[PDB]
């Protein structure tokens, strides 16, 4: 089986659980305020910082390199804008760094440092969602919180260097299928993607509790 297909099949169940998390149910209904939203975007700041640092460490590694798309995909600069929007000029000292975020970041460094053949599972889990349900979350955020169409506060959800998310996702999928793939690597990559989803589910369960 192609890796792109293996990953979708492996994560289709946990994806259902993730999109139906209590935090996300509240989001999709429109119940999340500025406070909740600042919490999740600050958490994403740390996650994508760790993820993109590990992507840089491994950019020339053949186990990842075909998926190296900083210009199109990387979120850190965009999140730095959003942090300045939501938290102001001294956001680096203002933003929270929660335990679940720390746990997620810790795994990203373990993977990037010790198991870079699995890094694709983590880039997959975040980026392809950003290019999918991410786009729906963006419209909900705009409506709920009165965020302007011009895009301030929602740079994270904006991909100026991609014309069509759907087309780019097809490209990224075909490119995943180009990675050197053994039964050993494909088994562990699909397992690591399931873990990536759980780390996200646990972040969202934590934030929901912090707010209630």
Annotated binding residue 104? no
Find where tokens 């050993």 sit.
Answer: 184
Question: What does each C-alpha distance from 3 to 103, 180, 181 come to in angstroms?
Answer: 26, 10, 8
Annotated binding residue 127? no
Helix boundaries (H) for the chain: 3-19, 22-29, 34-57, 70-73, 76-87, 91-94, 99-114, 119-123, 129-130, 133-145, 165-176, 183-211
Annotated binding residue 124? yes
Annotated binding residue 97? no
From first CA to last CA, the distance across the chain in angstroms is: 43
Known binding-site residue numbers: 8, 15, 124, 173
| Binding annotation for heme b | 8, 15, 124, 173
């Amino acid at each position: 089986q192609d890796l792109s297909e293996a990953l979708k099949e492996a994560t289709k169940e946990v994806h259902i659980r993730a999109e139906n998390s209590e935090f996300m149910r509240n989001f999709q209904k429109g119940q999340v305020s500025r406070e909740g939203f600042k919490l999740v975007m600050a958490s994403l700041y740390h996650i994508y910082t760790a993820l993109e640092e590990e992507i840089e460490r491994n950019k020339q590694n053949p186990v990842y390199a075909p998926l190296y798309f900083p210009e199109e995909l990387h979120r850190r600069a965009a999140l730095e804008q959003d942090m300045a929007f939501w938290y102001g000029p001294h956001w680096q000292e203002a933003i929270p760094y929660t335990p679940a975020t720390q746990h997620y970041v810790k795994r990203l460094h373990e993977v990037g440092g010790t198991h870079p053949e699995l890094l694709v599972a983590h880039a997959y889990t975040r980026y392809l969602g950003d290019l999918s349900g991410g786009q729906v979350l963006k419209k909900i955020a705009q409506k709920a919180m009165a965020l302007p169409s011009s895009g301030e506060g929602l740079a994270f959800f904006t991909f100026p260097s991609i014309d069509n998310p759907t087309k780019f996702k097809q490209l990224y999928r075909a490119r995943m299928n180009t990675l050197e793939m053994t039964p050993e690597v494909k088994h562990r990559v699909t397992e690591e993607a399931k873990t990536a989803f759980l780390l996200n589910i646990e972040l969202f369960e934590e934030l929901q509790a912090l707010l209630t």
